[PDB]
Amino acid sequence: MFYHISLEHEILLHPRYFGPNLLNTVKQKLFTEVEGTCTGKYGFVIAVTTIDNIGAGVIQPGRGFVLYPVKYKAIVFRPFKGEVVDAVVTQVNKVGLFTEIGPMSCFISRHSIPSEMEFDPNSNPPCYKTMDEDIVIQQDDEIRLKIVGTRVDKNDIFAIGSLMDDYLGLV
Template sequence: MVYLQISLEHEILLHPRYFGPMLSDTVRQMLFTEVEGTCTGKSTFHSNYSLNSPRYGFVIAVTTIDDIGSGMVQPGRGFVLYPIKYKAIVFRPFKGEVLDAIVSQVNKIGLFCEIGPMQCFISRHQPYPFLIRFLKKILHSRLTNFFNKFSIISDDLFGFRKGTNTTMAIFYLVLDLLKTYHSKEYCVALFLDLQKAFDCVNHQVLLGPSI
């Protein structure tokens, strides 16, 4: 991420009502309005960088206006086109560069970030949501059938499959505890909750009758 002073070009399309003694000032003011705060412009020269190909950046501020060319009347419209050469301070991120950003807003469609003077929007939109859901459904169905066919997943393993969530795991655990208690037998249980999967279960509802 760098800040550069580069030479840029821009064209101002001026309405005939602005023709008058303040024409030059009007052209300058329109240049400031149209280019500052935008990502536009072709770079033609910079003293510290070899920019042989067109470069673009976020124009922060116009520093100098080098030349205002002769206006050309547009046929059939009456507007006048002024080519302008100027220098400006630009903010220039490069492809593949890692930048620090401040997240300013998060909503259901994506998030907004501030990277220096620029604002960036990162969308959560999936280009082919129906196709993705369809492929996920097929993949899940085939994997489930494969695991069941070769008994890869034990019946005592809960999770990853429909109808075998953590709530059902605690339900069967309570049944086993009650059965052991009424049979006056000993019971030992070992809990390994690596992903905190049981935190979302209402334990009071499930364990209430057995307490």
């Protein structure tokens, strides 16, 4: 889920940016090097809503670089334990299901649900099909699933989705 919390970052600014556009260069550098990053504690950041303040720039002795502590507000999104999360479904292989909730490589195995749900290769678009063939889980539809697991994969997350709870189907 999407939170809105306070983050901290340090900016090493080269002396070539010590001009009238210094603080703007600091914001541009922050926007450059906080986007597309994930951590095992504060979650995957989405975007920087605003920057609270730019700290005092301490000049490092021995280097020209200046260290700028930055306090800012960023949207974070990580898996949670015991929570139901909306998901996106894509094409189905002969082994598993490809689900992508933003950057999440969430997977559904054969040891998370009872045998009321099956998959067949006879249909030209592969999809999850029951015996009654009422609910269809194919590419680009709305489902709900529960995640309990979380792992770190070098700014990537590996998790497992569950479908044990009822009414976790299409709207």
